[model samples]
Target: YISRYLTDFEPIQCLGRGGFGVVFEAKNKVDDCNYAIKRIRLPNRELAREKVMREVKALAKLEHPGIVRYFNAWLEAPPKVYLYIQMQLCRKENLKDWMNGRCTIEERERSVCLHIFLQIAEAVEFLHSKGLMHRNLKPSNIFFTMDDVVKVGDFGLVTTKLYMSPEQIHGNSYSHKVDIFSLGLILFELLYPFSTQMERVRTLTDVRNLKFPPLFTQKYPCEYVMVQDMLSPSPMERPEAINIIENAVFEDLDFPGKTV
Candidate 1:
């Protein structure tokens, strides 16, 4: 419901693409700070328009360390022009690149990885609490700032697929638990690289022979079946992200130098 002049931000370059729009890293002329702008140029399509406004409303109201922050949005129809949205600026790349450099997390590094998961978990919980759903949740969509804080970005497909759950690939009516399934996969990746056989679990109905990452020691009893629970065949079986936040079992680790 807000609009801005074209001169507000100085477009830098394309960051990535999602749906039919291009994401650009732009400098907000007023604040002199950089932000990510999603420039959607399309004729008046109801679905597209609804998605844009839904994302705008969602981002505008959501405020959390784990969720990307929204700054402003611009829209006009007389000229059938572009729809632009300003958001928090993430670092040069996403966690996929950050994780690509390493396949294994040392025992000392385990806490950091846990912290990352907790951040995403909290974001998902927050999203659901607001009566929203980020149907797409994966490593690439998760980003980190220069400060080393991780935030879940990419809402274009959030409410809609990648590393999707069994129900997702099956095209069954789904819910937030799908996010938990993908998260378990991500947690597995953090612990070890996925084998071809391991990736089969993505769309399979089998939960047999499932095993957790070795690091979840006696120190963390919760870790033993944490990922397993997330991948449960029953949607209700999966724990709510807020439940994780409330339970002493998934206590927040002392994330090094991490700020709220």
Candidate 2:
């Protein structure tokens, strides 16, 4: 009934294609509910089995509002290997689509952006507690629901430099520090979505050379210092993801005095 169960869900259209598989926008024929169906493909058979189980394992261990919720996973016809993973449908869009415009943040946008940032940080903090890291984190991998909930996805590949931490770029056995640095880069882009300004923060070298955009430098110089602290070369300098839950750098600001 495993294969039969997979067929019960009908795919309406292609959602996305990734290194290991194609995700389709699907609906359950029985439940009549929409969901994201990640159809696993590619990789040698043994490796496919290993990876999909890892996906299920890691995802199962994670129970956070900001992480994508998992519903079901099954293989197609056993050998042909379409591992169907049904997940929460996020129809609103991903951060990448949301950042298409270079518009400046308005008061409302600032709160929304900061709320999303805080949610993602909480989600990442949850992962670290489980000794897991979402090695792949970028605008495209982070999703939003119609309700404006942030969902970070695409666990990782043994990847390249765009989102890789410095230790990862050099092929080292790193801890969760990589995730910390990457999110700092993401915070910068979310704050300054302008492509012209983003051009400077794309690569590792550019990142090291980056400073708060003039707008941020002029507007929120103190917060800019916090941003700088997060992306420094030394991982120790970066705030611990778990600590963000109660850290001053991430606390609620009411324009008054605060403490750690």
Candidate 3:
């Protein structure tokens, strides 16, 4: 039920796209600030208005530095479109792009990745503590700020109620634990960048059957076990995000390495 002129802001370029909507970098002519806008394209005007309300209501209530800040949201008329969700823009590289750019990861790189993962785990823990479950916790959703702080982004797939259990795989009613499982997969991908292939490891079975080279294992034992436990087939077997951070090998007092 909100209306705004397209000329009010200038769209820079496409940021990314997903099932829900497309993100773009926009400049507010009046405020002179850069904001990331997520425009949702719905089937009808009524649904578009509904989604605008839902997103604003939920995101506005969520107040976490790790989560993207929801500045403002509104709906467009005529064709019934949702527009103008202003949020902070991320400058840090995603795990995928970070991995692709590296020819060979050194210990420092591994340590940095671990630190980033730990930060992400903490973010998930915070969300869970708030009774929110981020159903989609992939590497792509992990964002970095100009200050190099890792924050979790994209709340379009989040829900308040529990959805899945340890032994059961239901499409609905999943809990925050589902995000833990996803975090584990992302940890594995970061630790073993070379082994992750979207086409090759398409299913859970494919991931379960992954063969880690002995040399690689020897080089990174702590990371190996941490990722293994995280990707455990039984969701109940996986440790909670907070536990993973507290008891992780990185938390060991004697762990010799530090990020330079």
TM-score of each: 0.80, 0.83, 0.78
Model 3 alpha-carbon drift over 4 Å, by segment: 1-7, 44-52, 155-173, 195-206, 209-211, 252-260
Q: Write the per-residue lDDT of candidate 3 for residues 1-260, one digit (tens) a residue.
A: 33463677878887777665777888888998888788776645677657657756777777776777678777676534555577787763664566666535563366666777778887888888877777766666776677767768773422112112333355545456677767766766566545355532553334444455566468878776776777665667778877887865655332344433
Candidate 2 structure quality by residue, lDDT tens digits, 1-260: 45654468776887767677777787899999988877767367777668768867778666688988889877666635566777888864577667765454652254455566778888899888888888877777788776777888773221135666777778878878888888877776666655453563453345545544576667656446656767777777888886655655455643222122
lDDT of 1 by residue, 1-260 (tens): 43463567777887877676778888878889988888777647888768767767767888888888888877755535777777888886676666766544443366676777777788888888887877878877888877878888674422224457878888899887887787766665554533343453442323322554344434456654676777777878988877666756456567556565
| Of candidates 3 and 1, the better by lDDT | 1
Off by over 4 Å in 2: 1-6, 45-49, 155-160, 195-205, 249-260
Error of 2 at 22 (Å): 0.3
**Residue pairs with clashing backbones, model 3:** 162-173, 163-173, 163-174, 163-175, 164-173, 164-174
RMSD of each: 4.5, 4.8, 5.1
- For residue 96, model 3's alpha carbon misses the true position, in angstroms, by 1.6
The lDDT, on a scale of 0 to 1, for candidate 3 is 0.65
